[PDB]
Design a protein around this ligand. Structure first.
Ligand SMILES: [K+]
Ligand SMILES: [K+]
Ligand SMILES: [K+]
Ligand SMILES: [K+]
Ligand SMILES: [Mg+2]
Ligand SMILES: [Mg+2]
Ligand SMILES: [Mg+2]
Ligand SMILES: [Mg+2]
Lengths: 163, 288, 172, 209, 49, 49
RNA sequence: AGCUCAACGAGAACAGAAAUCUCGUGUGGAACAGAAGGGUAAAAGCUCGUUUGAUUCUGAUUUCCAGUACGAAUACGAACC
RNA sequence: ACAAAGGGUGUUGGUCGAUUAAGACAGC
RNA sequence: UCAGGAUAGCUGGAGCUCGCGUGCGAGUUCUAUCGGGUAAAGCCAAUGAUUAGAGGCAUCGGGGGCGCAACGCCCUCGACCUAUUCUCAAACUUUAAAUAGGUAGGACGGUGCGGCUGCUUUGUUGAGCCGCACCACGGAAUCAAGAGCUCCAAGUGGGCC
RNA sequence: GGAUGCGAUCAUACCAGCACUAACGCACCGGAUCCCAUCAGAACUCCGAAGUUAAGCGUGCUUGGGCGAGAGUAGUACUAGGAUGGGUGACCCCCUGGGAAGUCCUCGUGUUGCAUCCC
């Protein structure tokens, strides 16, 4: 409405991948969705029912409801000077389980194990990971050195493959 | 000349269908509609009653779908029926009924629900549905016909009736059982029982031996060799049903796998051998 | 692995008789009756696909009829048609897919008594030759292509016609 | 009738080719792009000269036609009508619009006025292949054609054999090894792929160059 | 007399004067819009808890 | 972005100085404001003074 | 539920560029009311069978957006088909 | 709070060629 | 309705709830994960546009010669097929950046038992929720002249570089 | 080492031309009384086991096409940020960073889950 249809400017967004049209693989319908799961919204152009608005395409949200064929997703949306947690319902064909938190549980388990080991030996440690820092000094074995010099200019080589 | 159709661009733009569709074995619309489960039921699996008819065998199995692939809860083959006394007509309506009953008994034994749900030991031709018990609901499975045509009197519906009599809850109607009349929207129980007991085969046998004895022999050589007459088919099928009900547990083969497997197919040539053959061919071509 | 296998025998799969009359009405009904009495089965009418003013036909006008015959009846009809043709066929009458056909101007030559009201009707004869195993391409489940070595070729069809009917093929 | 070329010299708009959206476009002034002995074999004209653009700008079809005519005329006068092959290497596919002067700038979107070519820096404008004995004539013909174009151009002597993509030494080496199939003015290089039976005796090679 | 038609100039600065505000997420979120059958069962379970 | 990074580095006035531990995160932050600052490796004498 | 379209190749009296019929190839180059863009091949296209979910009740959400209304659409619930 | 294409045997550096102590170019 | 008004945004005043580095935060980076079709590129990939030659082909093109004709013969130009080739696209595209967009990095966590249901399952099979017991060095960097909430209201709604 | 039934991934799996396969299977295959189905027992449906591995299915080969990976194209095209940078302009050098795509060349031609059976 108001000068723009629901699917305006979706020629590329809602189109299917090259040589990937037709029947949908069964893995899409065999997935399990539960409350609190993070999902990625990817519109399947062949499924016209339960289609999210184009804005939510390419955005990640959290599952808050589970119906027979669709799943409720809460997606942040910036409107002027605030963020709105807009709740939508989307069919499972248009949604994929997100990997944005795949390493969290593993890291927590390893941190707990390390903390328990440190407590056993009576030491205090920090399990926080750190950004890559400066490397220490080291010795590099001498080898044959190849000299690099600027190339004399030749106009005939200005074209790819030569003039 | 004529322009080439299978051009390079044609192959470049070509999208292959799913492998099971290219082989023409799986209908993915029906498969998807059969397996898709309500998401608010989570990891609850939908078992389906798969029945397939080969040229000389009947395959029946209960399957559940997973990402790694379908999982078989139980299976039953018509080639196992000779252990129960059925040696001929393994691909007819009665064989389908026996296979369905055997699979139902086997799966109920696997789930330890055989005692609670017994069905009707007698075949009968009337529409039947196992009555739910108080302890638990009957095991539920959905029929998976496949690519066959779902006509009235199809063997798949005979297997469905066998499974229903076994004590399995399979959603169904009575419009496709053998004996159902198109003109009158009713099921003829007598005709259904006749088909379940192979009486149509017996009638064909009698007609053939009355009219064309040589064709009767050419058509029922195996029946004659096994010494089964038209009148003895019903009692034989009753005995087969009784034997199936008495002991439905699948037998375990006593054969031992060979220590080494002999190869009977050609192996892919190595890079060196291929290059040697190419060199020989190129030398032969140039030396001309 | 040899060509003497009994499964490689060439047989007439079917014979299709086609009558294409531009107009629809009494003439079409008479042609359909002629086909029914010649083949013994009820023919099937064919509707026009496009509209051609010069031909005088209109879309969905039933401008033709045809029937498909298999078995001994097809063989007898083919024998009668070849007798009308004097067992003479042109080399071009054979297609590259192991099929051949011909045409006749008067159906009276096939054994039908002349009727002034009915008139005179010609017919189209086409014979499809196949070997056992062609079902793999017609069945619903596991549809597959017939091996090109097992397919009937133009040479195979010409040789079969020459041998069975003692026919002569002309180049012209 | 026609505005001065300075009005459309600079590339300021997106490409506007003739299509179903843009109709009523006049035909280009230049319709012939190859003149001279265009049927000469690839092995007869090893020398090649390029008139290379050094500016990003629009070149009108009229300018291309005039440059081609001048170059062809001088080449025919100097070296002869069968001693060279001239190929215009730029096609004008951009439609220029004009807002003919309802009142004012209301509804100003103009109608097609002409066609021009969008030329990048270092893009070849004209190519001439001939024998080594006509190199100076070719250079002077390109110099004469220079004055018909706007902007700055440069004459560059190619190191390739004729209009092919092979350098003269590489082309000679490939021909000596029997790896070149003449294809009109083009030359095809023999590889080590494809069906083996498709190769004639001596034309099959184990490894590519 | 014509005037300007539209522009987003200065709007992001206005939004950032006090934004971008993220509402605080509470431990328990509202159940409005969820499957009514599941909510009914949850209410009964809580009642009999 | 430049202003925000400069606040995060605590450089709010021209010719203000601060130490910064070398890190991929900190180095990438400093890369964005490079035109507005100059930096190097301080001496022991420099730090002490 | 069944079938596969446009087009092309080779064949069949009138019949030819174009009537109907046979085989082969055929990733959609057809069709799907209309503008265009997406989407669809044991189908969303063509044929046939049975039908009226173009039904009843209010709520929730999306698009517009002030996070008002209308229009349109989507996902559940409660009934009857 | 402008200047172009074309030019200069004004002068200043570079690039590629040709002739030359079996003697380079101009005049006798 | 177009020189106006209301409405949201921007602003003042009034505060209130808390907090003191243990921080419910950030117009910034890091790490891990997602979406994209612009720049570029491509036509030797679909659609569309476009130059040139090279090699072959016809009972079915316009011509010349040998011929009464010939489904007779030899060549020229055209169509046709094959492998190449110059140059192109806001409303073309296989491929496809940079910048920018979304999500997550614990005290609202984890583990083990027990319990509730009229929902769900063939099945205390699941799904949520609720109690008990234990662990949880604060779980990337930097900064944090602090964070959240509410009420009343002004002016503005011609911009320009 | 395979086949079959049901699949996952959905071409490294597709297309074309050649060659091969023990056993069980899968098939081709023989009929039309019955259920069922058409112009056509071709297809579909039902009842069978005389014959054949001829075809399908499976495996292998092709200096094959396609497809997938790498190298290269190329630090090229493009691009974020800077300059009281060059230039009449068009455009472009340099500084702090990111960084593609045809052509050409090399390699590869499926991997797998559950159940039954043969070896
Ligand atoms: K110029
Ligand atoms: K590209
Ligand atoms: K193209
Ligand atoms: K106001
Ligand atoms: Mg359908
Ligand atoms: Mg953008
Ligand atoms: Mg075979
Ligand atoms: Mg290849």
């Amino acid at each position: 409405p108001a000068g723009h249809g629901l699917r305006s400017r979706t020629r590329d967004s809602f189109s299917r991948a090259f040589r990937k049209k037709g029947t949908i693989p069964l893995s899409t319908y065999l997935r399990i969705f539960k409350i609190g799961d993070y999902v990625d919204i990817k519109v399947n152009g062949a499924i016209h029912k339960g289609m999210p608005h184009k804005f939510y395409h390419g955005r990640t949200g959290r599952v808050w409801n589970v119906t027979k064929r669709a799943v409720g997703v809460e997606v942040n949306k910036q409107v002027r000077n605030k963020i709105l947690r807009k709740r939508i319902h989307v069919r499972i064909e248009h949604v994929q389980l997100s990997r944005c938190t795949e390493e969290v549980k593993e890291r927590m388990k390893k941190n707990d194990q390390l903390k328990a080991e440190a407590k056993a030996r009576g030491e205090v440690i920090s399990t926080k990971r750190q950004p890559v820092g400066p490397k220490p000094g080291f010795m590099v074995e001498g080898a044959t050195l190849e000299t690099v010099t600027p190339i004399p200019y030749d106009v005939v080589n200005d074209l790819k493959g030569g003039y | 000349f004529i322009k080439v159709q299978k051009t390079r661009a044609y192959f470049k733009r070509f999208q292959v269908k799913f492998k099971r569709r290219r082989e023409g074995k799986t209908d993915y619309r029906a498969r998807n509609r059969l397996i898709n489960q309500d998401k608010n039921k989570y990891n609850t699996p939908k078992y389906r009653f798969v029945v397939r008819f080969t040229n000389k065998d009947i395959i029946a199995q209960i399957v559940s779908a997973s990402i790694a692939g379908d999982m078989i809860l139980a299976s039953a083959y018509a080639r196992e029926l000779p252990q129960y006394g059925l040696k001929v007509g393994l691909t007819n309506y009665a064989a389908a009924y026996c296979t369905g009953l055997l699979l139902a008994r086997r799966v109920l034994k696997k789930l330890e629900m055989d005692e609670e749900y017994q069905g009707n030991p007698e075949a009968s031709g009337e529409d039947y549905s196992v009555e739910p018990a108080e302890s638990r609901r009957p095991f539920r499975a959905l029929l998976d016909v496949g690519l066959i045509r779902t006509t009235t009197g199809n063997r798949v519906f005979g297997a469905l009736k066998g499974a229903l009599d076994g004590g399995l809850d399979i959603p169904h109607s009575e419009k496709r059982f053998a004996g159902f009349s198109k003109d009158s929207k009713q099921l003829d129980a007598d005709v259904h029982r006749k088909y379940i007991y192979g009486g149509h085969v017996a009638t064909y046998m009698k007609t053939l031996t009355e009219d064309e004895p040589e064709k009767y022999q050419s058509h029922f050589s195996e029946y004659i060799k096994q010494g089964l007459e038209a009148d003895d088919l019903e009692e034989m099928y009753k005995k087969v049903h009784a034997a199936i009900r008495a002991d439905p547990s699948p037998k375990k083969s006593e054969k031992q796998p060979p220590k080494q497997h002999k190869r009977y197919n050609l192996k892919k040539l190595t890079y060196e051998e291929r290059k040697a053959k190419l060199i020989e061919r190129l030398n032969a071509l140039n030396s001309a | 692995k040899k060509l003497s296998n009994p499964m490689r025998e060439i047989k007439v799969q079917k014979l299709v008789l086609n009558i294409s009359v531009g107009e629809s009405g009494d003439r079409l009904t008479r042609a359909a009756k002629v086909l029914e009495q010649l083949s013994g089965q009820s023919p099937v009418f064919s509707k026009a696909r496009y509209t051609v003013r010069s031909f005088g036909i209109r879309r969905n006008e039933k401008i033709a009829c045809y029937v498909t015959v298999r078995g001994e009846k097809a063989m007898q009809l083919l024998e009668s048609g070849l007798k009308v043709k004097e067992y003479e066929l042109l080399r071009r009458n054979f297609s590259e897919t192991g099929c051949f056909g011909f045409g006749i101007q008067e159906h009276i030559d096939l054994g039908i008594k002349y009727d002034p009201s009915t008139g005179i009707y010609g017919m189209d004869f086409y014979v499809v030759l196949e070997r056992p195993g062609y079902r793999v391409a017609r069945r619903r489940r596991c549809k597959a292509r017939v091996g090109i070595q097992h397919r009937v070729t133009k040479d195979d069809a010409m040789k079969w016609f020459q041998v069975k009917y003692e026919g002569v093929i002309l180049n012209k | 009738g026609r505005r001065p070329a300075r009005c459309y010299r600079q590339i300021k708009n997106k490409p506007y080719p003739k299509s179903r959206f843009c109709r009523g476009v006049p035909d280009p002034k230049i319709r012939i792009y190859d003149v001279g002995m265009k049927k000469k074999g690839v092995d007869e004209f090893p020398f090649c000269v390029h008139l290379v653009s050094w500016e990003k700008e629009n070149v009108s079809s009229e300018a291309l036609e005039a440059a081609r005519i001048a170059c062809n005329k001088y080449m025919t006068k100097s070296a002869g009508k069968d001693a060279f092959h001239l190929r215009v290497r730029v096609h004008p596919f951009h439609v220029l619009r004009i807002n003919k002067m309802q009142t004012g700038m209301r509804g100003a979107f103009g109608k097609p006025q002409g066609v021009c070519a969008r030329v990048a820096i270092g893009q070849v404008l004209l190519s001439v292949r001939c024998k080594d004995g006509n190199a100076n004539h070719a250079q002077e013909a390109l110099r004469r054609a220079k004055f018909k174009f706007p902007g700055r151009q440069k004459i560059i002597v190619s190191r390739k054999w004729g209009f092919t993509k092979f350098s003269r030494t590489d082309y000679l080496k490939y021909k000596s090894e029997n790896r070149i199939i003449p294809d009109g003015v083009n030359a095809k290089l023999l590889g080590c792929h494809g069906r083996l039976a498709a190769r004639q005796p001596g034309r099959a090679f184990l490894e590519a160059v | 007399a014509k005037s300007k038609n539209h522009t987003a100039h200065n709007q992001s600065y206005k939004a950032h004067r006090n934004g971008i505000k993220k509402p605080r997420k509470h431990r328990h979120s509202s159940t409005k819009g969820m499957d009514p059958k599941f909510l009914r069962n949850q209410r009964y379970a809580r009642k009999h808890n | 972005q430049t202003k925000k990074i400069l606040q995060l580095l605590r450089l709010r006035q021209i010719f203000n100085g601060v130490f910064l531990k070398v890190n991929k995160a900190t180095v990438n932050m400093l890369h964005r404001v490079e035109p507005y600052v100059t930096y190097g490796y301080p001496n022991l004498k420099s730090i002490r003074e």
